Design a protein around this ligand. Structure first.
Ligand SMILES: [Zn+2]
Ligand SMILES: [Zn+2]
Ligand SMILES: [Zn+2]
Ligand SMILES: [Zn+2]
Ligand SMILES: [Zn+2]
Ligand SMILES: [Zn+2]
Lengths: 692, 692
């Protein structure tokens, strides 16, 4: 009834031992980069998946793990996959729909529209119809798929002109239940479908024959609604879903499947979700646990902290300062623990203060006219310039589509001379007030070891210049470009400056090993002979930000950029770390530091989509400070956020809704957080009223 | 705490409902073809595997399954796979060996043979050695693999001339523990390795640092010994193992892994195992269950019946007569059940009687001189002709290698003019006494729908002749070849007589559907118009053996072959069933019926390797009767068997041993079962003494 891990040394874990209770709601929390993600995914998930797959992932660095079970990890890693999968097929409701239509589906004629009762054919059009079977309605079999598009619904993309995307031949679409065929039922929203199936009128024989199928369909639709996805349609392709929607769909499917004795590892399931759905998500998590499963949730939400059975805290810091287990126990024990950051923030010792004065617009506005892409109901939006603006709303209200595909693409085309197709809108006025646009996300800053934070921030050029300015370099005639591994002359010839080699085995994938000639230093022996203040290029690159802050104190220009890197909380990282190994948070922080370093002209706009992904409360505090500094520098920041801590500090809030899917697309409230809180018919205002 | 299956209709299951208790030793038994294999593998294993894999097999025909967990199926389906996997890597003992050698391995010089203590290098040969790491001993990484063969140990096959199959560079092989390096340790038998590690002398520091690794290695070797594989070597390639050895190795690995909350489905784990190892196998099964797992064992052994917690019986017959659940409960309840075949055989109501008179050799013998392949110790074996002979012995005693690769290949080369390489032997005398050799196994009788039991037995030609002899065929001028689907003229042109079509989907594997023109009848409309005694070719092919027995009563020649097919217990099968869908038992029975039908010349030899695979007690009784009939016909039958019921009826027994691996390869006892039972130092004799 326990999971015992001894000597976990994956990544930055400091050889820790942990005992995780089984069949409980266990939450792992800590600072970003503290090693919680390593401890969960790289150790427990990897071992649990390997021990099951090998009986039909790399082996983690751990002494032994006991009391393990097969592990399933749910994360935001959606893929396009295939066009043959939709929401209904993924959630396994299309199969039950096919069964129901085979059982009680009313046959019809696709030529005359009459009814066939039983020969099992019409006497008017002389058309013969076989007995109805569940496989007839499937679009993955030759018996039901539309022949032109072989059931795909599109041609490789344009809709199939025959079925108009119904993916089924005209013969199958004639069978209707309650006035709607299978495609028209699949075209309804999930809540609409649940209401439609709830009040269906049936005969005694039909009710007897289709009781179990109706019960299963109702249960699965209820699970989907409870997960917080009552605006989606069953016919929507699974490729077009976002990360959070895909994760919640997978969660609902796992709940509905009924599998038991499995360890579930969840990577922040509450991200991309409005605050009003937290209770529903927590109840769904508890329902999944009640089947006889163990839940490991990597979440930083306060409600998740309060709704958990056991909490494991990692820290105290991040990177080299993390990797330990500072505190563990129930929520009260965590709060009572003096040396826990999570307890410090929960107990109220540290908190984010509501500003007393807020910035005001200076008469410069960016107005969007006739925005009607996706579910936007032809609205006009005014975004003030020079202030911190937050875009809020329920899930599926169209805030993401509006912001991204009507603002970022249009501004990029207008200013950066980009070639992209914006969304359906009339025009935007106020573009002349800006000079450039920048979008910051969690995408990697590079795909090659040649790119590291030192080069990305531009401090490497100054480092090379000061290295070449030394007496030894001047005596030897070395130039500034000599100390760069991207050109021939100073880099190691064997590895071409990469520092690694590729070795191919006969029956194994290519393996990368450190280069033997340069020992991974990526520099020639002659160039490494030059030492500035007792350190060469290799030691300078290996140095962390904290060490480099003290090392380069004398030089002001380098010190400014190093301090900028340190302010975003990247003091634990080293300048020479390859961009391949950086995570999403590290890349985002590097981008933010680069933007802070540049001398802003006061005519730039920054767009961030859920910047508080995988960020602790302290990380959120630091990010809020950084964003406010960027705004005070003279630029404009627009953030799509669901976090109330970030929202309460914004100078302007735009709320979209009032619901999701086709029920949203309108503007509910706008103005300062107090003005939004004054609005009664707004969930964001209702929550802000309590928060303030 | 239960598994509930409702409306299982896979294959021949008659819409049954079953409740399988969880975390118990449950045995599913019944006649061959009764649907037990379907109910287990096609339903429970398929659903359990699908519900786990889809979250990262075809969907069975079942209403719903409740209380499911991820399922792992262990069966005799060994594959060559890759040459990079051995016994040590599969059982995960090589990793612990590498760890132990990194910890306490004594370094050495590969040039002078001195010892290195700490610079960490020798001062004589001036050879530098890095610090010892666990990855250094692995042959799957560039750091330790021999460079010529990249760690494979062979060249694509001949051994690598550099490492001589050690798979490691000469630097790694210098590190020795207790006078043996890693390869020499891996070259020992499992029992030898356990004894070697048990009495290893170590210092206090070494014992402190290597306690856990030694404990784990000892535990895993003990698991391997308990499974009944104490003769194998850790360096043996996993490709060369037999089905039973691979299954038992997988079982030992699963026991050692420690995974819990998994449903294990085993397909007759006791096959290919001597009777003396049944207790060890049962104890291992109980140990695997005690970890918190559910066991579903498809076994026909009496000891397994008596050692189980719950028994599920399927029947009453096979094929169309099976698919139900005749009885269930504990062993005593099964014995008390009047309508259970398993209970009928357990209670002693039905049993196989020991013959009172046994056949005697007629002076004709087949002698093998100088057989020394594999572990055979240059022995001479005399096999009498004209009697029923059984080859018995413990696992790994070399009976299979001897029999197959010294007798079947040699006889095939001598008589059938086959081109194969026999094993290492001097010569065989007595070949002139035989005329032909035949080997009967469970391999399929064909890979195409064109081959069915009717054509295999040769009765289809007679059926076509009598069909063409009818008045309508004579009037229409139809020939005998017209009623054959293998030639043009009578078969359907669309499907070319196959009766199925191939349809390719854009993103799906090829799907086979029945042909629309002929509706799967594989014949032209004009040819189907000819009816003999009110039935055409399609109905004749669709008819089962039982129906055809009464239908063709008037014709004696056809009736003889139909009765021959019926006598092997294939009365439930139909003449038109494609050979692709036949199982191993069905194919073996078809081959036996074909051999019985042929007019034997009295100079034929039949070789069978474990014919009682997947056979119930009644099936074993029928097979014994069939084999005795074949012997009485005038031929010679040689069977490699581990079943005592078959053994006690044989006229001659040859016992090999006395142990497995390098400890066997000799002849222990020979003669009639009583003579063998008289031998004290023979396990087969010891068990036969109690059986008789
Ligand atoms: Zn009609
Ligand atoms: Zn179409
Ligand atoms: Zn190099
Ligand atoms: Zn030496
Ligand atoms: Zn080699
Ligand atoms: Zn055809």
């Amino acid at each position: 009834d326990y999971i015992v891990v001894k000597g976990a040394r994956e990544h930055n874990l400091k050889n820790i031992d942990v005992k995780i209770p089984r069949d409980k709601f266990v939450v792992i929390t800590g600072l970003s980069g503290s090693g919680k993600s390593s401890l969960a995914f790289d150790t427990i998930y990897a071992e649990g998946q390997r021990r099951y797959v090998e009986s039909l992932m790399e082996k983690p660095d751990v002494d032994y793990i006991d009391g393990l079970s097969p592990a399933i990890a749910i994360d935001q890693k959606t893929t396009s996959r295939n066009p043959r999968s939709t929401v209904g097929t993924v959630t396994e409701i299309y199969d039950y729909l096919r069964l129901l239509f085979a059982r009680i589906g009313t046959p019809h004629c696709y030529l005359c529209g009459r009814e066939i009762s039983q020969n099992f054919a019409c006497t008017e059009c002389n058309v013969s119809m076989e007995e109805i079977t569940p496989r007839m309605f499937s679009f993955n079999n030759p018996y039901g798929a539309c022949p032109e598009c072989t059931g795909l619904g599109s041609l490789m993309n344009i809709p199939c002109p025959v079925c108009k995307g119904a993916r089924l031949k005209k013969e199958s679409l004639a069978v209707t239940i309650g006035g709607k065929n299978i495609y028209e039922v699949c075209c309804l929203s999930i809540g609409e479908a649940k209401e439609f199936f709830a009040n269906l009128n049936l005969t005694e024989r039909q009710q007897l024959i289709a009781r179990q199928i109706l019960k299963e369909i109702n249960a699965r639709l209820g699970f989907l609604v409870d997960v917080g996805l009552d605006y989606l349609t069953l016919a929507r392709a699974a490729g077009t879903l976002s990360g959070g929607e895909a994760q919640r769909i997978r969660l609902a499917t796992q709940i509905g499947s009924g599998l038991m004795g499995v360890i579930y590892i969840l990577d922040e399931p509450s991200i991309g979700l409005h605050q009003r759905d937290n209770d529903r998500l927590l109840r769904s998590l508890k329902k999944l646990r009640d089947l006889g499963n163990t839940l490991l949730v990597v979440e930083h939400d306060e409600d998740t902290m309060y709704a958990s059975d056991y909490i494991i805290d990692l820290g105290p810091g991040a990177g080299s300062h993390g990797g330990q287990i500072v505190a563990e126990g129930t929520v009260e024990e965590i709060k009572q623990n003096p040396n826990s950051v999570t307890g410090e923030y929960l107990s109220g010792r540290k908190k984010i203060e509501v500003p007393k004065e807020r910035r005001k617009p200076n008469g410069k506005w960016l107005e969007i006219i006739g925005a009607r892409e996706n579910n936007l109901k032809n609205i006009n939006v005014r975004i003030p310039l020079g202030v911190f603006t937050c875009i809020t709303g329920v899930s599926g209200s169209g805030k993401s589509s509006l912001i991204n595909e009507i603002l970022y693409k249009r501004l990029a085309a207008e200013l950066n001379r980009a070639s992209v197709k914006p969304g359906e809108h009339d025009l935007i006025k106020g573009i002349e007030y800006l000079d450039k646009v920048i979008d910051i996300d969690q995408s990697p800053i590079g795909r090659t070891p040649r790119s590291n934070p030192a080069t990305y921030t531009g401090v490497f050029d100054f480092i090379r210049e000061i290295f070449a300015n030394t007496t030894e370099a001047k005596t030897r005639g070395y130039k500034a470009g000599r100390f760069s591994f991207n050109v021939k002359g100073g880099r190691c010839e064997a590895c071409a400056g990469d520092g690694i080699n590729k070795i191919e085995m006969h029956f194994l994938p290519d393996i990368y090993v450190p280069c033997e000639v340069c020992k991974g230093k990526r520099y020639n022996r002659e160039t490494l002979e030059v030492r500035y203040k007792g350190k060469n290029i290799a030691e300078v690159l290996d140095m962390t930000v904290e060490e480099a802050l003290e090392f380069f104190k004398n030089i002001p220009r380098i010190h400014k950029k190093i301090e900028t890197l340190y302010d975003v909380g990247l003091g634990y990282i080293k300048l020479g770390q390859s961009s391949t190994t950086l995570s999403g948070g590290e890349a985002q922080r590097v981008k933010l530091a680069t933007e802070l370093s540049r001398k802003s002209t006061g005519k730039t706009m920054y767009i961030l989509d859920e910047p508080t992904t995988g960020l602790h409360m302290a990380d959120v505090h630091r990010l809020v400070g950084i964003l406010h500094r960027l705004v005070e520098a003279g630029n404009s920041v627009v953030v799509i956020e669901h976090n109330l801590d970030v929202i309460k500090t914004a100078d302007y809030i735009i709320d979209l809704g009032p619901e999701g899917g086709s029920g949203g697309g309108l503007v509910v409230a706008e103005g300062t957080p107090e003005e939004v809180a004054k609005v009664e018919n707004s969930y964001t205002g209702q929550f802000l009223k309590k928060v303030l």
